[PDB]
Nuclear receptor ROR-gamma
Amino acid sequence: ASLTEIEHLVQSVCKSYRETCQLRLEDLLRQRSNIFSREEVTGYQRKSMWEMWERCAHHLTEAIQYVVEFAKRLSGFMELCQNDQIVLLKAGAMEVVLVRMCRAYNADNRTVFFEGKYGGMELFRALGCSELISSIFDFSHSLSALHFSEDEIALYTALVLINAHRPGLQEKRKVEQLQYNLELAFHHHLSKTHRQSILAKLPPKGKLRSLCSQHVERLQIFQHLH
Ligand SMILES: C[C@H](CCC(=O)O)[C@H]1CC[C@H]2[C@@H]3[C@H](O)C[C@@H]4C[C@H](O)CC[C@]4(C)[C@H]3C[C@H](O)[C@]12C
Ligand SMILES: C[C@H](CCC(=O)O)[C@H]1CC[C@H]2[C@@H]3[C@H](O)C[C@@H]4C[C@H](O)CC[C@]4(C)[C@H]3C[C@H](O)[C@]12C
Ligand SMILES: CC(C)OC(=O)[C@H](C)N(C(=O)c1ccco1)c1c(Cl)cccc1Cl
């Protein structure tokens, strides 16, 4: 990959992200003052776990569908074989959704955009897993301290997905090459923007992996109990 190729790769990732970001950053920042009232929060807390799971599962289903579309518009992802495309999506799609959340997260008051307004994590009380939820909020909080640009979140989420270490890949060397190209493209774009300092501040790879382990576990328990 040349400099033209690395620059084209950056452009491709950023364009795909912009077209698949689901919620526009401008709309999310504008809505920060639109915050659930005490009555609306109590309204959520009184809902059954069943209904709350039904709303969350719908929210997550939609978010994952945009991530699938992100992958498919990515330079190189469609060049991979079907099996590998699926292995990567299966392992990474939800990890991308967790990362994507930080944009919809307001660190000033610790709220998230959910069903039209911002609310704290207490909104989700009826689900009965406050420790996992607070870890998700904590993760979003630490990411928001980096003030990710749109292009940065584009490149970073592309790297969460294009990971050659996922078990079950049939063309490991081809995924490696795509991964290496994205790592360099990311590093290069950060230097052009004087943002190299975020590299040392990025969460350790095991952090998102360990959070997604617990997450996918609880998700599957809700999936089966339904
Ligand atoms: C594919 C992956 C791993 C499952 C496996 O061990 O094979 C699983 C675990 C968490 C799952 C998701 C979560 O349970 C949340 C959603 C629940 C809905 O009932 C289906 C879509 C939904 C968006 C799920 C899609 C998919 O089955 C996920 C992403
Ligand atoms: C359950 C939901 C369908 C909702 C609907 O329209 O009724 C479907 C449609 C697209 C699905 C995803 C896509 O097919 C891509 C992935 C394919 C893998 O087989 C499972 C995980 C995977 C990440 C899927 C999870 C889930 O089952 C999704 C999100
Ligand atoms: C384990 C299941 C039952 O808990 C969730 O579903 C939680 C509520 N949840 C998430 O898990 C989530 C959000 C993004 C990725 O995962 C979520 C959050 Cl933390 C904020 C806004 C919207 C949602 Cl949907």
Q: What stands out?
A: The pocket of cholic acid (ligand 1) is lined by residues 57, 60-61, 64, 90, 93-94, 216, 219-220, 223 (CB under 6 Å).
